[PDB]
Protein backbone atom coordinates (compact mmCIF):
# COMPACT_ATOMS: atom_id res chain seq x y z
CA UNK A 1 0.00 0.00 0.00
CA UNK A 2 0.62 3.85 -0.49
CA UNK A 3 -0.44 6.91 0.76
CA UNK A 4 -0.14 10.42 -0.30
CA UNK A 5 -1.13 13.51 1.53
CA UNK A 6 -0.82 17.51 0.48
CA UNK A 7 0.49 19.69 3.25
CA UNK A 8 -0.60 23.61 3.68
CA UNK A 9 1.47 25.95 5.40
CA UNK A 10 -0.46 27.46 8.35
CA UNK A 11 0.18 30.80 7.46
CA UNK A 12 2.01 33.68 5.30
CA UNK A 13 5.25 32.26 7.24
CA UNK A 14 5.36 28.65 6.90
CA UNK A 15 5.50 28.85 10.42
CA UNK A 16 4.18 25.08 10.37
CA UNK A 17 2.44 22.69 8.01
CA UNK A 18 -0.94 20.61 8.33
CA UNK A 19 -2.00 17.61 6.39
CA UNK A 20 -5.51 16.37 6.16
CA UNK A 21 -6.22 12.85 8.64
CA UNK A 22 -9.24 10.48 8.48
CA UNK A 23 -9.97 9.06 11.98
CA UNK A 24 -13.01 7.22 13.07
CA UNK A 25 -16.16 5.93 11.09
CA UNK A 26 -17.38 7.30 9.45
CA UNK A 27 -14.65 9.93 8.99
CA UNK A 28 -13.58 12.98 11.15
CA UNK A 29 -10.87 14.82 9.11
CA UNK A 30 -8.46 16.77 11.10
CA UNK A 31 -5.82 18.87 10.07
CA UNK A 32 -2.56 17.90 12.43
CA UNK A 33 0.73 19.15 12.43
CA UNK A 34 2.95 16.01 11.11
CA UNK A 35 5.96 16.30 13.60
CA UNK A 36 9.01 13.75 13.27
CA UNK A 37 10.42 15.11 15.97
CA UNK A 38 7.88 12.85 18.30
CA UNK A 39 5.80 10.10 17.85
CA UNK A 40 2.60 10.69 19.68
CA UNK A 41 -1.10 10.90 17.74
CA UNK A 42 -2.84 13.42 19.92
CA UNK A 43 -5.75 15.53 18.92
CA UNK A 44 -8.88 18.42 19.97
CA UNK A 45 -11.21 15.92 21.40
CA UNK A 46 -15.09 16.48 23.28
CA UNK A 47 -13.11 15.79 25.76
CA UNK A 48 -10.81 18.92 25.65
CA UNK A 49 -11.85 21.36 28.45
CA UNK A 50 -14.41 23.49 26.49
CA UNK A 51 -12.25 27.04 27.64
CA UNK A 52 -9.34 25.90 25.68
CA UNK A 53 -10.81 25.02 22.26
CA UNK A 54 -11.10 28.25 20.08
CA UNK A 55 -11.77 27.29 16.86
CA UNK A 56 -10.06 24.15 16.33
CA UNK A 57 -11.77 21.05 15.21
CA UNK A 58 -12.59 18.17 17.34
CA UNK A 59 -12.43 14.27 17.41
CA UNK A 60 -15.70 12.78 19.26
CA UNK A 61 -14.91 9.22 19.24
CA UNK A 62 -19.07 8.48 20.27
CA UNK A 63 -19.46 9.50 16.89
CA UNK A 64 -17.36 7.00 15.78
CA UNK A 65 -18.65 3.24 15.39
CA UNK A 66 -14.81 2.07 15.27
CA UNK A 67 -13.39 3.83 18.46
CA UNK A 68 -12.78 2.01 21.38
CA UNK A 69 -11.08 3.26 24.84
CA UNK A 70 -7.94 1.79 25.05
CA UNK A 71 -8.29 1.25 29.66
CA UNK A 72 -6.07 3.01 32.01
CA UNK A 73 -4.10 4.58 29.08
CA UNK A 74 -3.39 8.15 29.37
CA UNK A 75 -0.92 10.45 27.63
CA UNK A 76 1.00 13.75 28.76
CA UNK A 77 3.45 15.33 26.26
CA UNK A 78 5.26 18.55 26.96
CA UNK A 79 7.61 20.14 23.66
CA UNK A 80 10.60 22.32 23.40
CA UNK A 81 8.77 25.25 23.00
CA UNK A 82 6.89 25.06 26.46
CA UNK A 83 3.53 24.05 25.47
CA UNK A 84 1.47 20.53 26.62
CA UNK A 85 -1.18 18.53 26.23
CA UNK A 86 -2.25 15.60 27.96
CA UNK A 87 -5.25 13.23 27.85
CA UNK A 88 -7.22 9.98 27.30
CA UNK A 89 -6.67 7.17 24.95
CA UNK A 90 -8.89 5.48 21.84
CA UNK A 91 -8.04 3.41 19.47
CA UNK A 92 -9.51 4.08 15.52
CA UNK A 93 -9.40 3.80 12.74
CA UNK A 94 -6.42 6.43 10.73
CA UNK A 95 -6.21 7.43 7.48
CA UNK A 96 -3.68 9.60 5.94
CA UNK A 97 -3.70 10.19 1.90
CA UNK A 98 -5.55 6.97 1.20
CA UNK A 99 -3.25 4.97 3.25
CA UNK A 100 -5.45 3.09 6.65
CA UNK A 101 -4.19 1.67 9.93
CA UNK A 102 -6.97 -0.04 11.54
CA UNK A 103 -6.29 0.00 15.69
CA UNK A 104 -4.54 3.32 16.06
CA UNK A 105 -3.99 5.22 19.17
CA UNK A 106 -5.49 8.28 18.62
CA UNK A 107 -4.75 10.48 21.91
CA UNK A 108 -7.72 12.36 22.64
CA UNK A 109 -6.58 16.08 24.44
CA UNK A 110 -8.10 17.02 27.97
CA UNK A 111 -6.10 19.79 28.65
CA UNK A 112 -4.09 21.97 26.06
CA UNK A 113 -1.81 24.83 26.71
CA UNK A 114 -2.37 28.51 25.42
CA UNK A 115 -0.41 28.18 22.42
CA UNK A 116 -2.39 25.03 21.71
CA UNK A 117 -5.65 27.14 22.09
CA UNK A 118 -4.63 30.21 20.23
CA UNK A 119 -3.69 28.42 16.95
CA UNK A 120 -6.81 27.36 15.45
CA UNK A 121 -5.53 25.94 12.83
CA UNK A 122 -3.74 23.29 14.55
CA UNK A 123 -6.36 20.66 15.13
CA UNK A 124 -3.60 18.29 17.20
CA UNK A 125 -0.64 16.51 16.01
CA UNK A 126 0.58 13.27 13.86
CA UNK A 127 4.19 11.78 15.78
CA UNK A 128 6.60 10.61 12.92
CA UNK A 129 9.39 10.18 15.30
CA UNK A 130 10.57 6.69 16.57
CA UNK A 131 8.23 4.83 19.05
CA UNK A 132 10.32 4.48 22.08
CA UNK A 133 8.90 8.35 22.48
CA UNK A 134 5.85 7.51 22.79
CA UNK A 135 4.13 9.27 26.18
CA UNK A 136 1.20 6.43 26.59
CA UNK A 137 1.52 5.21 30.04
CA UNK A 138 1.33 2.30 31.39
CA UNK A 139 1.68 0.37 28.03
CA UNK A 140 3.54 2.55 25.25
CA UNK A 141 1.91 2.89 21.43
CA UNK A 142 3.27 2.83 18.23
CA UNK A 143 3.55 5.24 15.85
CA UNK A 144 1.06 5.85 12.59
CA UNK A 145 4.11 5.09 10.49
CA UNK A 146 5.13 2.10 13.24
CA UNK A 147 1.64 0.33 12.32
CA UNK A 148 1.50 0.85 8.48
CA UNK A 149 5.27 -0.06 7.65
CA UNK A 150 4.71 -3.77 7.32
CA UNK A 151 1.40 -2.85 4.48
CA UNK A 152 3.58 -0.35 2.80
CA UNK A 153 5.11 -1.10 -0.68
CA UNK A 154 8.64 0.00 0.98
CA UNK A 155 9.09 1.39 4.71
CA UNK A 156 9.42 4.43 4.26
CA UNK A 157 8.01 8.16 4.02
CA UNK A 158 8.75 11.17 2.58
CA UNK A 159 8.37 14.93 3.14
CA UNK A 160 8.10 17.57 0.64
CA UNK A 161 7.63 20.58 1.98
CA UNK A 162 6.74 23.79 -0.10
CA UNK A 163 8.01 27.21 0.61
CA UNK A 164 4.94 29.56 0.93
CA UNK A 165 3.26 26.59 -0.64
CA UNK A 166 1.47 23.62 -0.52
CA UNK A 167 3.46 20.22 -0.76
CA UNK A 168 3.51 17.01 0.21
CA UNK A 169 4.30 13.99 2.39
CA UNK A 170 3.91 9.76 0.66
CA UNK A 171 4.12 6.87 2.64
CA UNK A 172 5.44 3.82 1.04
CA UNK A 173 7.25 4.90 -1.71
CA UNK A 174 9.44 7.80 -3.32
CA UNK A 175 8.18 9.86 -6.03
CA UNK A 176 11.01 9.88 -8.52
CA UNK A 177 9.58 13.30 -10.51
CA UNK A 178 9.45 15.60 -7.04
CA UNK A 179 13.61 16.13 -6.86
CA UNK A 180 16.39 16.76 -8.89
CA UNK A 181 19.33 15.09 -9.29
CA UNK A 182 19.99 11.57 -6.53
CA UNK A 183 19.22 11.12 -3.26
CA UNK A 184 22.02 10.85 -0.78
CA UNK A 185 21.79 8.81 2.18
CA UNK A 186 23.31 9.25 5.40
CA UNK A 187 23.08 7.39 9.00
CA UNK A 188 20.56 7.78 11.35
CA UNK A 189 21.00 7.08 14.88
CA UNK A 190 17.68 5.99 16.73
CA UNK A 191 19.38 6.21 20.68
CA UNK A 192 17.65 9.48 21.55
CA UNK A 193 14.59 8.40 19.61
CA UNK A 194 14.73 10.75 17.12
CA UNK A 195 15.92 10.79 13.26
CA UNK A 196 19.28 12.37 14.10
CA UNK A 197 22.09 12.33 11.67
CA UNK A 198 25.34 14.14 10.89
CA UNK A 199 25.74 17.09 8.81
CA UNK A 200 29.09 17.25 6.68
CA UNK A 201 29.38 21.21 7.45
CA UNK A 202 27.84 24.27 5.82
CA UNK A 203 28.77 27.67 3.79
CA UNK A 204 26.94 30.98 3.88
CA UNK A 205 25.98 32.40 0.56
CA UNK A 206 28.43 32.32 -2.17
CA UNK A 207 31.35 31.78 0.44
CA UNK A 208 33.76 28.60 0.80
CA UNK A 209 32.16 25.74 2.31
CA UNK A 210 33.30 24.57 5.79
CA UNK A 211 33.87 20.80 6.50
CA UNK A 212 32.81 20.38 10.13
CA UNK A 213 30.37 17.49 11.68
CA UNK A 214 26.98 18.81 12.75
CA UNK A 215 24.83 16.75 14.50
CA UNK A 216 21.45 17.46 14.80
CA UNK A 217 18.07 16.27 13.91
CA UNK A 218 15.13 16.18 10.70
CA UNK A 219 12.38 17.59 12.51
CA UNK A 220 9.37 18.74 10.40
CA UNK A 221 7.54 19.69 13.94
CA UNK A 222 10.01 22.84 14.64
CA UNK A 223 9.91 25.78 12.23
CA UNK A 224 13.32 27.17 12.24
CA UNK A 225 16.99 25.74 11.52
CA UNK A 226 18.39 25.74 14.84
CA UNK A 227 22.66 25.11 14.71
CA UNK A 228 25.40 25.79 16.99
CA UNK A 229 26.73 29.69 17.52
CA UNK A 230 29.56 29.68 15.42
CA UNK A 231 27.81 28.35 12.57
CA UNK A 232 25.09 31.40 13.29
CA UNK A 233 26.66 33.62 13.90
CA UNK A 234 29.30 33.22 10.82
CA UNK A 235 25.40 33.48 8.79
CA UNK A 236 24.73 36.41 10.48
CA UNK A 237 27.75 38.47 10.50
CA UNK A 238 26.79 38.47 6.72
CA UNK A 239 23.62 40.42 7.31
CA UNK A 240 23.25 44.49 7.83
CA UNK A 241 22.19 45.35 11.01
CA UNK A 242 22.12 41.65 11.97
CA UNK A 243 22.01 41.22 15.83
CA UNK A 244 21.60 38.88 18.33
CA UNK A 245 18.24 40.20 20.58
CA UNK A 246 17.65 38.88 24.19
CA UNK A 247 14.76 40.75 24.49
CA UNK A 248 13.36 39.39 21.34
CA UNK A 249 15.06 35.72 21.94
CA UNK A 250 17.38 35.41 18.72
CA UNK A 251 18.76 37.05 15.94
CA UNK A 252 17.16 39.84 14.14
CA UNK A 253 17.67 41.50 11.32
CA UNK A 254 16.61 44.86 9.13
CA UNK A 255 13.28 43.86 7.26
CA UNK A 256 15.14 45.92 4.14
CA UNK A 257 17.69 42.90 4.00
CA UNK A 258 18.29 40.67 1.13
CA UNK A 259 19.54 37.48 2.77
CA UNK A 260 22.33 34.99 2.23
CA UNK A 261 21.74 31.52 0.95
CA UNK A 262 22.61 28.81 3.83
CA UNK A 263 24.07 25.48 2.50
CA UNK A 264 24.38 22.50 4.57
CA UNK A 265 26.24 19.37 3.86
CA UNK A 266 24.71 15.73 2.98
CA UNK A 267 27.66 13.51 3.01
CA UNK A 268 29.16 14.67 -0.38
CA UNK A 269 26.23 16.33 -1.38
CA UNK A 270 24.74 20.09 -0.76
CA UNK A 271 21.63 21.62 0.12
CA UNK A 272 20.89 24.88 -0.42
CA UNK A 273 18.75 26.93 1.50
CA UNK A 274 17.74 30.31 -0.13
CA UNK A 275 17.95 33.30 1.60
CA UNK A 276 14.29 34.08 1.22
CA UNK A 277 13.76 30.79 3.59
CA UNK A 278 15.53 32.65 6.22
CA UNK A 279 13.00 35.83 6.68
CA UNK A 280 10.51 34.96 9.46
CA UNK A 281 9.10 38.90 9.05
CA UNK A 282 8.28 41.46 11.33
CA UNK A 283 9.34 40.75 15.32
CA UNK A 284 6.08 42.32 16.12
CA UNK A 285 2.90 43.85 13.60
CA UNK A 286 4.76 46.99 12.06
CA UNK A 287 7.98 46.58 12.86
CA UNK A 288 11.09 46.96 10.78
CA UNK A 289 13.32 44.35 13.16
CA UNK A 290 12.26 41.28 11.64
CA UNK A 291 13.26 37.92 13.06
CA UNK A 292 15.38 35.33 11.47
CA UNK A 293 15.16 31.57 10.11
CA UNK A 294 18.78 30.62 11.45
CA UNK A 295 19.38 30.24 14.94
CA UNK A 296 21.63 29.26 18.10
CA UNK A 297 20.38 25.66 19.38
CA UNK A 298 22.90 26.27 22.50
CA UNK A 299 21.26 25.63 25.72
CA UNK A 300 18.60 23.15 23.49
CA UNK A 301 21.03 20.30 23.92
CA UNK A 302 20.70 19.21 19.95
CA UNK A 303 20.91 21.17 16.50
CA UNK A 304 17.48 20.93 14.74
CA UNK A 305 17.16 20.62 11.41
CA UNK A 306 13.71 22.28 11.05
CA UNK A 307 11.44 23.09 8.54
CA UNK A 308 13.75 26.34 7.05
CA UNK A 309 15.97 23.33 6.15
CA UNK A 310 13.65 20.37 5.16
CA UNK A 311 11.96 22.65 2.91
CA UNK A 312 14.72 23.06 0.69
CA UNK A 313 14.78 19.00 0.38
CA UNK A 314 13.19 15.94 -0.98
CA UNK A 315 13.22 14.33 2.32
CA UNK A 316 13.35 10.23 2.73
CA UNK A 317 12.96 8.71 6.36
CA UNK A 318 13.80 5.51 5.34
CA UNK A 319 12.15 3.10 8.10
CA UNK A 320 13.74 -0.44 6.76
CA UNK A 321 15.69 -2.70 9.80
CA UNK A 322 18.63 0.02 9.85
CA UNK A 323 16.81 3.37 9.24
CA UNK A 324 18.51 6.04 7.30
CA UNK A 325 18.06 9.56 5.92
CA UNK A 326 17.73 10.72 2.08
CA UNK A 327 18.04 14.01 1.23
CA UNK A 328 17.67 15.48 -2.64
CA UNK A 329 17.83 19.16 -4.20
CA UNK A 330 14.26 19.99 -6.01
N1 LIG B 1 7.60 26.55 17.51
C1 LIG B 1 7.89 25.67 16.55
O1 LIG B 1 9.06 25.39 16.17
C2 LIG B 1 6.70 25.01 15.86
N2 LIG B 1 5.41 25.67 15.67
C3 LIG B 1 4.18 25.15 15.99
C4 LIG B 1 3.28 26.11 15.70
N3 LIG B 1 3.90 27.22 15.21
C5 LIG B 1 5.18 26.91 15.21
N1 LIG C 1 8.39 17.67 19.03
C1 LIG C 1 9.46 18.17 18.47
N2 LIG C 1 9.50 18.35 17.17
C2 LIG C 1 10.59 18.61 19.31
C3 LIG C 1 10.36 19.29 20.50
C4 LIG C 1 11.42 19.69 21.30
C5 LIG C 1 12.73 19.42 20.93
C6 LIG C 1 13.85 19.94 21.75
F1 LIG C 1 13.74 19.60 23.03
F2 LIG C 1 15.02 19.52 21.36
F3 LIG C 1 13.92 21.27 21.72
C7 LIG C 1 12.96 18.73 19.75
C8 LIG C 1 11.91 18.32 18.95
Redesign the pocket.
Known sequence: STGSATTTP?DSLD??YITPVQIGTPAQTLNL?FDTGSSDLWVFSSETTASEVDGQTIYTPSKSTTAKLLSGATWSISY??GSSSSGDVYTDTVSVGGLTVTGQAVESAKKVSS?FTE?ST?DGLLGLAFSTLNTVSPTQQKTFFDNAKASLDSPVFTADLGYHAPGTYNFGFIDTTAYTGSITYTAVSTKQGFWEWTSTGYAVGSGTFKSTSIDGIADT????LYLPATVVSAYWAQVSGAKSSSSVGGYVFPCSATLPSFTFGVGSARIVIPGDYIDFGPISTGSSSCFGGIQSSAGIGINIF?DVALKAAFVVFNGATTPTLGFASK
Open positions: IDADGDSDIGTTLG
